[PDB]
Each structure stands twice: as structure tokens, then as C-alpha cells.
């Protein structure tokens, strides 16, 4: 893997806006020397949006949300958890 600036960021936002990013679950179609299973990535970042301001970048890999390890997570769990966070969000990426 050895890539993407490991960051620990915390984003806050206005009650009726989005944090400003888009995620994407990706499944590996290939057993081999690496490793299989689910992984979610930020795919789009709104310029000026809070996620941008927090220092988040498209390509960042979501490993921890609000102290919650995200592996094995389906896209919807990741989304449900993020909505479970109101206007506050803490993220440890990759």
C-alpha cells in the first residue's frame, strides 16, 4: 500500500450543508500477493467546502471514522455512520 499522507482530521459543518466530499467502495476482483476485500475512498471534494478546509483530498482512504474502524464496511454503513455524526466528523485516512 505504502501511500497517501496518513492524516487525522476533524471536520465540522453547517446544519444544512454536506461535509463536501464523495465516497466510493471498491472491491478487488483478484486474489494474489496483496489483499482482498472492501475499501472506501473519497472520490470528489467540493472546493471551499469544510472537507476541503479540513485538509481532505480525493484519493484519501477512510480507515477510521469517529474512532470506528471501517473495514468490511459496505458503502451504506459508511454513509449511515457519517449521518450518525450530525455536523461533526473525525476521520483517520490513508
Shortest distance, CB of residue 31 to a second copy, whole angstroms?
10
Nearest CA to 79 out of 69, 65, 90 is that of 65
Q: How far apart are CA 94 and CA 91, in angstroms?
A: 10
Nearer to a second copy, 32 or 67 (CB): 32
DSSP code for 9: E
Contact 9, 89 (CB under 8 A): no
Judged by CB under 8 A, the number of residues near a second copy is 23
Residue 22 interacts with a second copy (CB under 8 A): yes or no: yes
Nearer to a second copy, 43 or 53 (CB): 43
**Residues at the contact surface with a second copy, assessed by CB under 8 A:** 1-4, 22-30, 32-34, 43-44, 57-59, 74-75
Amino acid at each position: 500500500f505504502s501511500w497517501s499522507q496518513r492524516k487525522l482530521v476533524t471536520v465540522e459543518k453547517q446544519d444544512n450543508e454536506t461535509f463536501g466530499f464523495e465516497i466510493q467502495s471498491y472491491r478487488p476482483q483478484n486474489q494474489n500477493a496483496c489483499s482482498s476485500e472492501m475499501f472506501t475512498l473519497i472520490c470528489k471534494i467540493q472546493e471551499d467546502s469544510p472537507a476541503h478546509c479540513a485538509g481532505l483530498q480525493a484519493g484519501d482512504v477512510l480507515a477510521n471514522i469517529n474512532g470506528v474502524s471501517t473495514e468490511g464496511f459496505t458503502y451504506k454503513q459508511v454513509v449511515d455512520l457519517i449521518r450518525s455524526s450530525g455536523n461533526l466528523l473525525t476521520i483517520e485516512t490513508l
